[PDB]
Design a protein around this ligand. Structure first.
Ligand SMILES: [Zn+2]
Length: 200
């Protein structure tokens, strides 16, 4: 589910000591408690990856965390100031923040993987038309990892559903497999970070 870019000007820089140090600033709009929630979510990367989110000093490439419309991030390192939105009303949860930070690392939604049609059916007629593009298949760098229903990057079955009970995504051949967890990073989520950023 990683974006395909050969240059890695596209990705965060790895230091000679192996750490991928990603500078950030958090909008003054957030209270101290909200800052702590964001930084808490960032710590989830420390135990099992070489990713380190650190407060910016004066680095050129950095993440600016802002409370805008919904929860979103740019994909990968964009160069200079790049925004990541954690709306104060709907996004201040560890798993959601981790999901967004994974976008910033270069990871896309699980259901858009190039191999997705072997694991899910997209029920187009059930999807809010303006939001259907979120379900488009992409030419992803899958990093020799398999499709993971339990990925923090997988949409829930009712994501952008027009009406209750008519799901946007149905897992196949077993429709009962859970999708859409936002508790924490899956084994494959962690493995993918480590493969992409060559963490040792
Ligand atoms: Zn997302």
């Amino acid at each position: 589910n990683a974006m395909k870019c050969w240059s890695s000007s596209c990705f965060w820089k790895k230091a000679s000591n192996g750490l991928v140090v990603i500078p950030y600033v958090i909008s003054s709009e957030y209270s101290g408690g909200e800052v702590a929630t964001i930084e808490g979510a960032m710590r989830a990367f420390n135990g099992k990856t070489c990713i380190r989110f650190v407060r910016r000093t004066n680095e050129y490439d950095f993440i600016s965390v802002v409370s805008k419309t919904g929860c979103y991030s740019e994909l990968g390192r964009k160069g200079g100031q790049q925004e990541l939105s954690i709306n104060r009303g709907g996004c201040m949860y560890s798993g959601i923040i981790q999901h967004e930070l994974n976008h910033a690392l270069g990871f896309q939604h699980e259901q858009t993987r190039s191999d997705r049609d072997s694991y899910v059916r997209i029920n187009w007629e059930n999807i809010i038309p303006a939001s259907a593009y979120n379900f488009n298949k992409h030419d992803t760098n899958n990093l020799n990892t398999p499709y993971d229903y339990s990925s923090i990057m997988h949409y829930g079955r009712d994501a952008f559903s027009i009406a209750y009970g008519r799901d946007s995504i149905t897992p196949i051949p077993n429709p009962n497999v859970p999708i859409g967890q936002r508790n924490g990073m899956s084994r494959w989520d962690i493995t993918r970070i480590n493969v992409l950023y060559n963490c040792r």
